[PDB]
């Protein structure tokens, strides 16, 4: 609440002291995590703070705009009308925490849409003049965030996960050496690998009971999806079964040994590693489960899914019992190539989408890109209660986008199923 007072101060009277407090609060904004320190600094020096209650119209389709924004909290509905009356505006999508919008002020272009707060919200705003100055001075650090024509239409293991893989392999080679070895299966020999069930066994017994095998599976998956732990053949998902997996370091015949320094390192630096995977586990697990058809999920899968839906803000306007039923019906879909068209304006639709990873461009004929959506954002909700065709097109803005999808047939079945009480 301190940063708010800093932003509520005049720009010219802001000490680099204030700038530091505002900076800290803003460094975490999804749309900012890719900003050059100096850029995010300028913003802290010229930006303002707005707190809006639900139901307020920030601005209207057809007007000349005055500010650029970043959602700090709450969410907003983007509405567009095909007529001349705002009465005919339908909600196209919803913007959430971390998303920015309003860049059409750069060339004085009239707003393509009407934005209405959907709930109590907090925004960071930058006025026209300032924003234009910033854009000219930090363009290359923005061309990936802004919709065309101000930005562009579109745009191996991790480093942390690659370290956890290292740290576990040594703890296993240290405490349970017998776990990594050549294994004979069917007149064939698999070199230096581990066994699914035994990895789970070992994870549970190490620090923290981890409470369950399922939890363990999610945590190992975190490594297998990032490529540090791979199924001896190719499988994309980790299974608590008699299947062989291999760590990266064991990819070559000859391999170095944890030369004490590491062991000393692993020793101390292992505890947090488990806690880290523990945190990152539930997600990886859900995306592995949702790949199973609605009728092939165990009582346990649905719980793992449910647990995670509770963290999805786009679903916070739904009853617990409703979200419970949703786990057995949710659909998951990813697309590897940017430029891919999820659906086009004019097509029938019956699906509501929520973004898990990536971003998309919302295109409306004759106008172009009216706004870009990111993680946490959702679109197509109108298709769950209305038969009108898609009022816009959705195009992937980058590679490897993940989505959560809810279809109208399944949503209604649930809504009435819950009327049975």
Q: What is 134-189 written as a DSSP string?
A: HHHHHGGGTTTTSPTTTS-S-----SHHHHHHHHHHHHHHHH-GGGSEEEE-SS-E
Half-sphere exposure of 20 (CA within 13 A, CB side): 3
The Cα-based distances of 224 to 211, 273, 369, 384, 407 in angstroms read 21, 15, 37, 36, 30
Number of Cβ within 10 Å of residue 317's Cβ equals 10
Considering the domain architecture, whether residues 8 and 104 belong to the same structural domain is answered as: yes
Of the three residues 155, 178, 207, the one that is the final residue of a domain is: 155
Question: Residue 274 is inside which H or E element, if any?
Answer: helix 271-289
**Burial class (CB within 10 angstroms; exposed 0-12, middle 13-18, buried 19+) of 9:** middle
Alpha-carbon span 95 to 74, nearest angstrom: 9
Collapsing DSSP to helix, strand or coil, 52 comes out as: strand
CA 197 to the chain's CA centroid: 30
Considering the domain architecture, whether residues 305 and 258 belong to the same structural domain is answered as: yes
Residues 149/258, Cβ–Cβ less than 8 Å: no
Considering the domain architecture, whether residues 149 and 169 belong to the same structural domain is answered as: no
Considering the domain architecture, whether residues 3 and 100 belong to the same structural domain is answered as: yes
Q: What is the DSSP string of 304-346?
A: HHHHHHTT-GGGTTS-HHHHHHHHHH-EEEEE-STT-EEE-TT
Q: What are phi and psi of 81, to 5 degrees?
A: -115, 140
Residues 119/74, Cβ–Cβ less than 8 Å: yes
User: What's 41's domain CATH number?
Assistant: 2.60.120.10
Residues 397/360, Cβ–Cβ less than 8 Å: yes
Considering the domain architecture, whether residues 138 and 183 belong to the same structural domain is answered as: no
Considering the domain architecture, whether residues 344 and 285 belong to the same structural domain is answered as: no
Beta bridge partners of 183: 190
Q: Report the number of distinct structural domains present in the chain.
A: 3
Q: Which of 367, 344, 361 is nearest to 112 (CA)?
A: 367
Question: Residue 299 is inside which H or E element, if any?
Answer: helix 299-309
Number of Cβ within 10 Å of residue 104's Cβ equals 22
Annotated binding site: 380-383, 390-391
Considering the domain architecture, whether residues 125 and 195 belong to the same structural domain is answered as: no
Half-sphere exposure of 90 (CA within 13 A, CB side): 17
CA 390 to the chain's CA centroid: 24
Considering the domain architecture, whether residues 345 and 233 belong to the same structural domain is answered as: no
Beta bridge partners of 393: 363
Instruction: Give the pairing type, strands 393-396 and 341-343.
Output: antiparallel
Considering the domain architecture, whether residues 257 and 351 belong to the same structural domain is answered as: no
Angle in degrees, 0-180, between the axes of helices 160-175 and 213-225, rounded to the nearest 10 = 120
Of the three residues 155, 173, 206, the one that is the final residue of a domain is: 155
Considering the domain architecture, whether residues 252 and 365 belong to the same structural domain is answered as: no
User: What's 195's domain CATH number?
Assistant: 1.10.10.10
Collapsing DSSP to helix, strand or coil, 412 comes out as: helix
Alpha-carbon span 191 to 14, nearest angstrom: 63
127 Cβ contact partners less than 8 Å away, ≥ 6 residues apart: 46, 48, 66, 67
Q: CA torsion angle for 22, 28, 31, 37 (degrees, to 10)?
A: 60
The Cα-based distances of 196 to 63, 119, 285 in angstroms read 60, 46, 15
Experimental method: X-ray
**Burial class (CB within 10 angstroms; exposed 0-12, middle 13-18, buried 19+) of 276:** middle
Annotated binding site for 3',5'-cyclic AMP: 380-383, 390-391
Residues 303/323, Cβ–Cβ less than 8 Å: no
Alpha-carbon span 94 to 312, nearest angstrom: 13
**Burial class (CB within 10 angstroms; exposed 0-12, middle 13-18, buried 19+) of 327:** buried
Considering the domain architecture, whether residues 166 and 109 belong to the same structural domain is answered as: no
Tokens standing for residue 312: 């999805």
Of the three residues 280, 312, 344, the one that is the final residue of a domain is: 312
Q: Which of 106, 109, 103, 105 is nearest to 62 (CA)?
A: 109
Q: Which domain holds residue 353?
A: 313-421
Considering the domain architecture, whether residues 3 and 142 belong to the same structural domain is answered as: yes
Tokens standing for residue 188: 């064939």
Residues 215/278, Cβ–Cβ less than 8 Å: yes
Question: Residue 51 is inside which H or E element, if any?
Answer: strand 48-52
Alpha-carbon span 312 to 293, nearest angstrom: 21
Residues 407/331, Cβ–Cβ less than 8 Å: yes
């Amino acid at each position: 609440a301190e940063w708010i007072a800093c932003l509520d101060k005049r720009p010219l009277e802001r000490s680099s002291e204030d700038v530091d407090i505002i900076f800290t609060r803003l460094k975490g904004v999804k749309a900012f995590e890719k900003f050059h320190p100096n850029l995010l600094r300028q913003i802290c020096l010229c930006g303002y703070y707005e707190n809006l209650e639900k139901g307020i119209t920030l601005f209207r389709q057809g007007d000349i705009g005055t500010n650029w924004y970043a959602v700090l909290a709450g969410s907003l509905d983007v509405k567009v009308s095909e007529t001349s009356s705002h009465q005919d505006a339908v909600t196209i999508c919803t913007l959430g925490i971390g998303t920015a919008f309003g860049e059409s002020i750069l060339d004085n272009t009239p707003r393509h849409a009407t934005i209405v707060t959907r709930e109590s919200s907090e925004l960071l705003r930058i006025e026209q003049e300032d924003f234009k100055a910033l854009w000219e001075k930090y363009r290359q650090y923005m061309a990936g965030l802004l919709a065309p024509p101000y930005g562009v239409m579109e745009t191996v293991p991790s480093e942390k996960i690659l370290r956890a893989g290292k740290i576990l392999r040594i703890a296993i080679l240290s405490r349970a050496p017998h776990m990594i070895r050549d294994r004979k299966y069917h007149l064939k020999t698999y070199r230096q690998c581990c066994v699914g069930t035994e990895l789970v066994d070992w994870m549970i017994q190490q620090t923290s009971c981890v409470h369950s095998r399922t939890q363990a599976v999610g945590m190992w998956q975190v490594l297998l999806e990032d490529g540090v732990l791979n199924h001896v053949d190719q499988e994309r998902h980790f299974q608590d079964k008699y299947l062989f997996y291999r760590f990266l370091d064991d990819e070559r015949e000859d391999a170095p040994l944890p030369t004490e320094e590491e062991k000393k390192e692993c020793d101390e630096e292992l505890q947090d590693t488990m806690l880290l995977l523990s945190q990152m586990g539930p997600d990886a697990h859900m995306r592995m489960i949702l790949r199973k058809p609605p009728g092939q999920r165990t009582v346990d899968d649905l719980e793992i899914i449910y647990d995670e839906l509770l963290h999805i803000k786009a679903l916070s306007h739904l009853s617990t019992t409703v979200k419970r039923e949703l786990a057995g019906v949710l659909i998951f879909e990813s697309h590897a190539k940017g430029g891919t068209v999820l659906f086009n304006q004019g097509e029938e639709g019956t699906s509501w989408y929520i973004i898990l990873k990536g971003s998309v461009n919302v295109v409306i004929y004759g106008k172009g890109v009216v706004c870009t959506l990111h993680e946490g954002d959702d679109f197509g909700k109108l298709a769950l209660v209305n038969d009108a065709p898609r009022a816009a097109s959705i195009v992937l803005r980058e590679d490897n986008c993940h989505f959560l999808r809810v279809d109208k047939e399944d949503f209604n079945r649930i809504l009435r199923d819950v009327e049975a009480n």
